[PDB]
CSV table of C-alpha atoms and ligand atoms in Angstrom, one decimal:
chain,number,residue,atom,x,y,z
H,1,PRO,CA,24.3,-33.9,44.3
H,2,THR,CA,26.2,-31.4,46.5
H,3,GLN,CA,29.1,-29.2,45.4
H,4,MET,CA,32.3,-31.2,45.7
H,5,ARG,CA,36.0,-30.2,45.7
H,6,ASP,CA,38.3,-32.3,43.5
H,7,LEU,CA,40.8,-33.3,46.1
H,8,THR,CA,43.7,-35.7,46.1
H,9,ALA,CA,43.7,-38.4,48.8
H,10,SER,CA,46.9,-36.8,50.2
H,11,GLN,CA,45.1,-33.4,50.5
H,12,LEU,CA,42.0,-35.0,52.0
H,13,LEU,CA,44.1,-36.9,54.6
H,14,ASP,CA,45.9,-33.6,55.6
H,15,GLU,CA,42.5,-32.1,56.5
H,16,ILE,CA,41.8,-35.0,58.9
H,17,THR,CA,43.0,-34.5,62.5
H,18,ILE,CA,42.2,-37.8,64.2
H,19,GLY,CA,39.3,-40.2,63.7
H,20,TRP,CA,36.8,-42.3,65.8
H,21,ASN,CA,35.1,-45.6,65.0
H,22,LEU,CA,31.4,-46.1,65.9
H,23,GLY,CA,32.3,-49.6,66.9
H,24,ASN,CA,30.1,-52.6,67.8
H,25,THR,CA,27.0,-50.7,66.4
H,26,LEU,CA,26.0,-50.9,62.8
H,27,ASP,CA,28.7,-53.5,62.4
H,28,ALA,CA,26.9,-55.8,64.9
H,29,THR,CA,25.7,-59.1,63.3
H,30,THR,CA,23.0,-61.5,64.5
H,31,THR,CA,23.4,-64.1,61.8
H,32,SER,CA,23.4,-67.2,64.0
H,33,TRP,CA,20.4,-66.4,66.1
H,34,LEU,CA,18.1,-63.7,64.5
H,35,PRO,CA,17.5,-63.7,60.8
H,36,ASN,CA,16.0,-60.5,59.4
H,37,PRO,CA,16.7,-58.1,62.2
H,38,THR,CA,15.2,-54.7,62.0
H,39,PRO,CA,17.7,-51.9,62.0
H,40,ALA,CA,17.3,-51.3,65.8
H,41,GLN,CA,17.7,-55.0,66.6
H,42,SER,CA,21.0,-55.0,64.8
H,43,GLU,CA,22.3,-51.7,66.1
H,44,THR,CA,21.7,-52.7,69.8
H,45,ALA,CA,22.6,-56.4,69.4
H,46,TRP,CA,26.0,-56.1,71.0
H,47,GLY,CA,24.9,-53.8,73.8
H,48,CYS,CA,25.4,-50.3,72.5
H,49,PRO,CA,22.5,-47.8,72.9
H,50,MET,CA,20.9,-46.5,69.7
H,51,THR,CA,23.2,-43.8,68.2
H,52,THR,CA,22.4,-40.1,68.5
H,53,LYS,CA,23.7,-36.9,67.0
H,54,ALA,CA,24.5,-35.8,70.5
H,55,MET,CA,27.0,-38.7,70.6
H,56,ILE,CA,28.8,-37.5,67.5
H,57,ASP,CA,28.6,-33.9,68.7
H,58,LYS,CA,30.6,-35.1,71.8
H,59,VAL,CA,33.1,-37.0,69.6
H,60,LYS,CA,33.7,-33.8,67.7
H,61,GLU,CA,34.1,-31.7,70.9
H,62,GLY,CA,36.7,-34.2,72.1
H,63,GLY,CA,39.0,-33.3,69.2
H,64,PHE,CA,38.0,-35.8,66.5
H,65,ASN,CA,37.0,-34.5,63.1
H,66,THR,CA,36.5,-37.9,61.3
H,67,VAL,CA,34.2,-40.8,62.1
H,68,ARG,CA,34.4,-44.2,60.6
H,69,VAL,CA,31.0,-45.9,60.4
H,70,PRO,CA,31.6,-49.7,60.1
H,71,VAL,CA,28.5,-51.3,58.7
H,72,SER,CA,27.6,-55.0,58.4
H,73,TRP,CA,25.1,-55.5,55.6
H,74,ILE,CA,24.8,-59.3,55.5
H,75,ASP,CA,21.8,-59.6,57.8
H,76,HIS,CA,20.1,-56.8,55.8
H,77,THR,CA,20.9,-58.2,52.3
H,78,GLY,CA,18.3,-60.3,50.4
H,79,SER,CA,18.6,-63.6,48.5
H,80,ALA,CA,20.8,-64.0,45.5
H,81,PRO,CA,21.2,-62.9,42.8
H,82,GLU,CA,19.6,-59.5,43.4
H,83,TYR,CA,21.0,-59.1,46.9
H,84,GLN,CA,18.4,-56.3,47.6
H,85,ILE,CA,19.4,-54.3,50.7
H,86,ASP,CA,16.5,-53.7,53.2
H,87,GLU,CA,15.3,-50.2,52.7
H,88,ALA,CA,14.8,-49.6,56.4
H,89,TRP,CA,18.5,-50.5,57.0
H,90,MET,CA,19.7,-48.2,54.2
H,91,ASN,CA,17.6,-45.5,55.8
H,92,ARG,CA,19.1,-45.9,59.3
H,93,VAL,CA,22.7,-46.0,57.9
H,94,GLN,CA,22.0,-42.8,56.1
H,95,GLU,CA,20.7,-41.2,59.3
H,96,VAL,CA,23.9,-42.1,61.2
H,97,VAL,CA,26.1,-40.9,58.3
H,98,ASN,CA,24.3,-37.6,58.4
H,99,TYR,CA,25.1,-37.2,62.1
H,100,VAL,CA,28.7,-37.0,61.0
H,101,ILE,CA,28.3,-35.1,57.7
H,102,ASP,CA,26.0,-32.6,59.3
H,103,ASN,CA,28.7,-31.9,61.8
H,104,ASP,CA,31.1,-30.9,59.0
H,105,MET,CA,33.2,-34.0,59.7
H,106,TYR,CA,34.8,-36.6,57.4
H,107,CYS,CA,33.0,-39.9,57.3
H,108,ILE,CA,34.1,-43.4,56.2
H,109,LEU,CA,31.4,-45.9,55.2
H,110,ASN,CA,32.3,-49.5,54.5
H,111,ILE,CA,31.1,-53.1,54.4
H,112,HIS,CA,32.2,-54.8,57.5
H,113,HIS,CA,31.5,-58.4,58.8
H,114,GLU,CA,30.7,-60.0,55.5
H,115,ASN,CA,33.0,-63.0,55.8
H,116,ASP,CA,30.2,-65.6,55.6
H,117,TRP,CA,30.1,-64.9,51.9
H,118,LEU,CA,33.2,-62.7,51.2
H,119,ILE,CA,35.7,-65.6,50.8
H,120,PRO,CA,39.1,-65.0,49.1
H,121,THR,CA,39.5,-68.1,46.9
H,122,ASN,CA,39.5,-68.6,43.1
H,123,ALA,CA,36.4,-70.8,43.3
H,124,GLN,CA,34.4,-68.2,45.1
H,125,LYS,CA,35.8,-65.2,43.2
H,126,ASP,CA,33.1,-64.9,40.5
H,127,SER,CA,30.3,-65.2,43.0
H,128,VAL,CA,31.8,-62.7,45.5
H,129,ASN,CA,32.6,-60.2,42.8
H,130,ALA,CA,29.0,-60.4,41.6
H,131,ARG,CA,27.7,-59.7,45.1
H,132,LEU,CA,30.2,-56.9,45.7
H,133,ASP,CA,29.0,-55.2,42.5
H,134,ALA,CA,25.3,-55.7,43.6
H,135,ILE,CA,25.7,-54.2,47.0
H,136,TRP,CA,28.2,-51.4,46.2
H,137,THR,CA,26.0,-50.3,43.4
H,138,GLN,CA,23.1,-49.9,45.9
H,139,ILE,CA,25.3,-48.2,48.5
H,140,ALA,CA,27.1,-45.9,46.1
H,141,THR,CA,23.8,-45.0,44.5
H,142,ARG,CA,22.2,-44.1,47.9
H,143,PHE,CA,25.2,-42.0,48.9
H,144,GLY,CA,26.3,-40.7,45.5
H,145,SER,CA,25.1,-37.1,46.2
H,146,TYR,CA,27.6,-36.5,49.1
H,147,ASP,CA,30.6,-34.3,48.8
H,148,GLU,CA,34.3,-35.1,49.4
H,149,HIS,CA,33.8,-35.5,53.2
H,150,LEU,CA,32.2,-39.0,52.5
H,151,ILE,CA,34.7,-41.8,51.8
H,152,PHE,CA,33.7,-45.3,50.7
H,153,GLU,CA,35.8,-48.2,52.0
H,154,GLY,CA,35.3,-51.3,50.0
H,155,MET,CA,36.0,-54.0,52.6
H,156,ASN,CA,37.2,-54.4,56.2
H,157,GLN,CA,39.4,-57.4,57.0
H,158,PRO,CA,39.0,-59.9,54.1
H,159,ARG,CA,40.8,-63.1,54.9
H,160,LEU,CA,40.9,-66.9,54.8
H,161,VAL,CA,38.7,-67.8,57.8
H,162,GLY,CA,39.8,-71.0,59.5
H,163,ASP,CA,43.2,-71.2,57.8
H,164,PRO,CA,46.3,-71.7,60.0
H,165,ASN,CA,47.5,-68.4,58.6
H,166,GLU,CA,44.1,-66.6,58.7
H,167,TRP,CA,45.6,-63.7,60.7
H,168,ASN,CA,49.1,-64.3,59.1
H,169,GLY,CA,48.7,-63.3,55.5
H,170,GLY,CA,46.7,-66.4,54.4
H,171,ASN,CA,48.0,-67.8,51.1
H,172,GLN,CA,49.0,-66.3,47.9
H,173,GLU,CA,45.7,-67.2,46.2
H,174,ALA,CA,43.8,-65.3,48.9
H,175,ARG,CA,46.0,-62.2,48.6
H,176,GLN,CA,45.7,-62.2,44.8
H,177,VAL,CA,41.9,-62.7,44.9
H,178,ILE,CA,41.5,-59.8,47.3
H,179,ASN,CA,43.2,-57.6,44.6
H,180,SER,CA,40.3,-58.6,42.3
H,181,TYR,CA,37.7,-57.7,45.0
H,182,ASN,CA,39.3,-54.3,45.6
H,183,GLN,CA,39.3,-53.7,41.8
H,184,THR,CA,35.6,-54.6,41.5
H,185,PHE,CA,34.7,-52.2,44.3
H,186,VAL,CA,36.5,-49.3,42.6
H,187,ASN,CA,35.0,-50.3,39.2
H,188,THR,CA,31.5,-50.5,40.7
H,189,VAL,CA,31.7,-47.1,42.5
H,190,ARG,CA,33.1,-45.3,39.5
H,191,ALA,CA,30.4,-46.7,37.2
H,192,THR,CA,27.6,-44.9,39.2
H,193,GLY,CA,29.1,-41.6,38.1
H,194,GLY,CA,28.2,-38.2,39.5
H,195,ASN,CA,30.2,-37.2,42.6
H,196,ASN,CA,31.3,-40.9,42.9
H,197,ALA,CA,33.4,-40.4,39.9
H,198,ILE,CA,36.0,-38.4,41.9
H,199,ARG,CA,35.2,-39.5,45.5
H,200,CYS,CA,38.2,-40.8,47.6
H,201,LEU,CA,38.0,-44.5,48.1
H,202,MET,CA,39.6,-46.7,50.7
H,203,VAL,CA,40.8,-50.3,50.2
H,204,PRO,CA,42.4,-52.8,52.7
H,205,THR,CA,45.2,-55.3,52.3
H,206,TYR,CA,44.6,-58.9,53.2
H,207,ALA,CA,43.1,-58.7,56.8
H,208,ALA,CA,44.0,-54.9,56.7
H,209,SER,CA,47.4,-56.2,57.8
H,210,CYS,CA,50.8,-54.6,57.0
H,211,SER,CA,53.4,-57.4,56.6
H,212,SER,CA,55.9,-58.5,54.1
H,213,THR,CA,53.6,-61.0,52.5
H,214,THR,CA,50.4,-58.9,52.4
H,215,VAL,CA,52.4,-55.9,51.1
H,216,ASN,CA,54.3,-57.9,48.5
H,217,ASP,CA,51.2,-59.3,46.8
H,218,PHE,CA,49.1,-56.2,47.1
H,219,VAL,CA,48.1,-54.6,43.8
H,220,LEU,CA,46.7,-51.1,43.9
H,221,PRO,CA,43.5,-51.0,41.8
H,222,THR,CA,43.5,-49.3,38.5
H,223,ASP,CA,41.2,-46.2,38.6
H,224,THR,CA,39.6,-43.7,36.2
H,225,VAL,CA,40.7,-40.6,38.1
H,226,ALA,CA,44.1,-39.6,39.6
H,227,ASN,CA,45.3,-40.0,43.2
H,228,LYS,CA,42.0,-40.9,44.9
H,229,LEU,CA,42.9,-44.2,46.5
H,230,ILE,CA,43.8,-44.8,50.2
H,231,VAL,CA,45.0,-48.0,51.8
H,232,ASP,CA,43.6,-48.9,55.2
H,233,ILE,CA,45.8,-50.7,57.7
H,234,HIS,CA,44.6,-51.8,61.1
H,235,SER,CA,47.4,-51.8,63.7
H,236,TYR,CA,46.7,-52.7,67.3
H,237,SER,CA,50.4,-52.5,68.2
H,238,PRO,CA,52.3,-53.5,70.0
H,239,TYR,CA,50.3,-56.7,69.9
H,240,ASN,CA,51.1,-58.1,73.4
H,241,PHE,CA,50.2,-54.8,75.1
H,242,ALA,CA,47.4,-53.4,72.9
H,243,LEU,CA,45.4,-56.4,71.6
H,244,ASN,CA,46.2,-59.6,73.6
H,245,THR,CA,43.9,-59.8,76.6
H,246,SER,CA,46.3,-62.2,78.3
H,247,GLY,CA,49.4,-60.1,77.6
H,248,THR,CA,51.2,-57.6,79.7
H,249,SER,CA,49.6,-54.3,81.0
H,250,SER,CA,53.1,-52.6,81.2
H,251,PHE,CA,54.5,-50.3,78.5
H,252,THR,CA,58.3,-50.1,78.3
H,253,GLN,CA,61.0,-48.4,76.3
H,254,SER,CA,61.4,-51.5,74.2
H,255,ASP,CA,57.7,-51.2,73.3
H,256,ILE,CA,58.4,-47.7,72.1
H,257,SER,CA,61.1,-49.0,69.8
H,258,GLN,CA,58.9,-51.8,68.5
H,259,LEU,CA,56.1,-49.2,67.8
H,260,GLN,CA,58.7,-47.1,65.9
H,261,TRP,CA,59.6,-50.1,63.6
H,262,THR,CA,55.9,-51.1,63.1
H,263,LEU,CA,54.6,-47.7,62.0
H,264,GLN,CA,57.7,-47.1,60.0
H,265,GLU,CA,56.9,-50.3,58.0
H,266,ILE,CA,53.4,-48.9,57.3
H,267,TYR,CA,55.0,-45.8,55.9
H,268,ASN,CA,57.7,-47.5,53.9
H,269,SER,CA,55.2,-50.0,52.4
H,270,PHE,CA,52.6,-47.4,51.2
H,271,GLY,CA,53.2,-43.7,51.9
H,272,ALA,CA,56.8,-43.8,50.9
H,273,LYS,CA,55.6,-45.4,47.6
H,274,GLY,CA,53.0,-42.7,46.7
H,275,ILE,CA,50.1,-44.7,48.2
H,276,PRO,CA,48.3,-42.7,50.8
H,277,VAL,CA,47.7,-44.8,53.9
H,278,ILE,CA,45.5,-44.5,57.0
H,279,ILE,CA,45.4,-46.5,60.2
H,280,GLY,CA,41.7,-47.0,60.2
H,281,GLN,CA,41.7,-49.0,63.4
H,282,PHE,CA,44.0,-48.8,66.4
H,283,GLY,CA,43.6,-49.0,70.2
H,284,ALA,CA,44.9,-50.5,73.4
H,285,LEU,CA,42.7,-52.7,75.6
H,286,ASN,CA,41.7,-51.6,79.1
H,287,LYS,CA,43.9,-53.6,81.4
H,288,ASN,CA,43.4,-51.3,84.5
H,289,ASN,CA,46.6,-49.6,83.3
H,290,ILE,CA,45.8,-46.0,82.6
H,291,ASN,CA,49.4,-44.8,83.1
H,292,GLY,CA,50.7,-47.5,80.7
H,293,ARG,CA,48.1,-46.6,78.1
H,294,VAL,CA,48.8,-42.9,78.4
H,295,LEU,CA,52.5,-43.5,77.6
H,296,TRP,CA,51.5,-45.9,74.8
H,297,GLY,CA,49.1,-43.4,73.3
H,298,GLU,CA,51.5,-40.4,73.4
H,299,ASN,CA,54.1,-42.5,71.5
H,300,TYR,CA,51.7,-44.0,69.0
H,301,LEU,CA,50.4,-40.6,67.9
H,302,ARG,CA,53.9,-39.0,67.9
H,303,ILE,CA,55.3,-41.7,65.6
H,304,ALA,CA,52.2,-41.6,63.4
H,305,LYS,CA,52.5,-37.9,62.9
H,306,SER,CA,56.1,-38.2,62.0
H,307,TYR,CA,55.1,-40.2,59.0
H,308,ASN,CA,52.0,-38.1,58.4
H,309,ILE,CA,49.7,-41.1,59.0
H,310,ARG,CA,46.2,-40.4,60.3
H,311,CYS,CA,44.8,-42.7,62.9
H,312,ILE,CA,41.2,-43.8,63.8
H,313,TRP,CA,40.4,-45.2,67.3
H,314,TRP,CA,38.3,-48.3,67.6
H,315,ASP,CA,35.7,-47.3,70.1
H,316,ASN,CA,33.3,-50.2,71.0
H,317,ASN,CA,31.8,-48.7,74.1
H,318,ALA,CA,33.1,-51.6,76.2
H,319,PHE,CA,34.9,-50.8,79.5
H,320,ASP,CA,34.8,-53.7,81.9
H,321,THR,CA,33.0,-56.4,79.9
H,322,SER,CA,34.0,-60.0,79.4
H,323,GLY,CA,35.4,-59.1,76.0
H,324,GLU,CA,37.7,-56.6,74.3
H,325,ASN,CA,37.4,-53.4,76.2
H,326,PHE,CA,38.3,-50.6,73.8
H,327,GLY,CA,35.8,-48.0,74.9
H,328,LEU,CA,36.8,-44.4,75.2
H,329,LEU,CA,33.5,-42.4,75.1
H,330,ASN,CA,31.0,-43.7,77.6
H,331,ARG,CA,27.8,-43.6,75.4
H,332,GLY,CA,25.5,-44.1,78.4
H,333,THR,CA,26.5,-40.9,80.1
H,334,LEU,CA,28.1,-39.0,77.2
H,335,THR,CA,31.4,-38.7,79.1
H,336,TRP,CA,35.0,-39.6,78.3
H,337,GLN,CA,35.7,-42.6,80.5
H,338,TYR,CA,39.6,-42.2,80.3
H,339,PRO,CA,40.1,-38.4,79.9
H,340,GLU,CA,43.9,-38.9,80.5
H,341,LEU,CA,44.0,-41.2,77.5
H,342,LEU,CA,42.0,-38.8,75.2
H,343,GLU,CA,44.4,-36.0,76.2
H,344,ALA,CA,47.4,-38.2,75.5
H,345,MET,CA,46.2,-38.8,71.9
H,346,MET,CA,45.1,-35.2,71.3
H,347,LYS,CA,48.4,-33.4,72.3
I,1,NA,NA1,21.2,-61.9,54.3
């Protein structure tokens, strides 16, 4: 176990500058077509090249001092009830985490696309809580020796898949059950002891969404140490410009006003109430609209800083694919594909 400062979440978040997601990488799943992938088969399954320290070096040089490492464990988790995590996968995750930690950066490690089993209903609650404890015990034990620069995030976007309001707050039952899942995660990490007793921990709302219904029903977990919990909100806003592939590519003054209200709501919901909050995912799709995204990006970061809210770009290394093109660092050439946009978010 390494020497660790006893920092509050607010103090830790003030040392972050801006963050970068290693997207569509260790979070890639193959569930429907390749059971039991080896670590490399998963990491490359969605088209990204295998990750290198040189990549993270470049992220740091670009002005980011924090990397979120989204990790999907489902394809690497054994049968119930032991839910043994494949040793080779745990080893590879640790290698990538070390690319960040060895760069003196902050690192956020989570569980990501677990929705096949992580279902927020009363019927599933006991079974899901049992598996959360099984896997977070393994993960927290492997990484317990790390200092304050490593943050555990208990879940990504827990939600009611298939429900008419899946992406609209679900139902009250789902929002309340997610409170139990967040509490189990905190309980499981703290029980491993050591540095994990005072590590900062991140928890999402329903779908990591900030809205009246997800905020109203949210219950901050009870903890065994003071001021170590952080809420993660994902906010690809304004929606029509930043997230909707069939929405406008123009960014207007009205969009600036909407962004002001949206990020203000994140602050008023959590930071204004003594709950530290981070925007763990944000971005704007490539719509062949560099001038629009530059104006969007300058205003997003300006407003975020005015509420002291840190932001983490979702970088999925996709530029002109058939899908969501949120790439920023071209991993194939180790070059920034849209340097104007990087500068807009670093100024
Ligand atoms: Na599995």
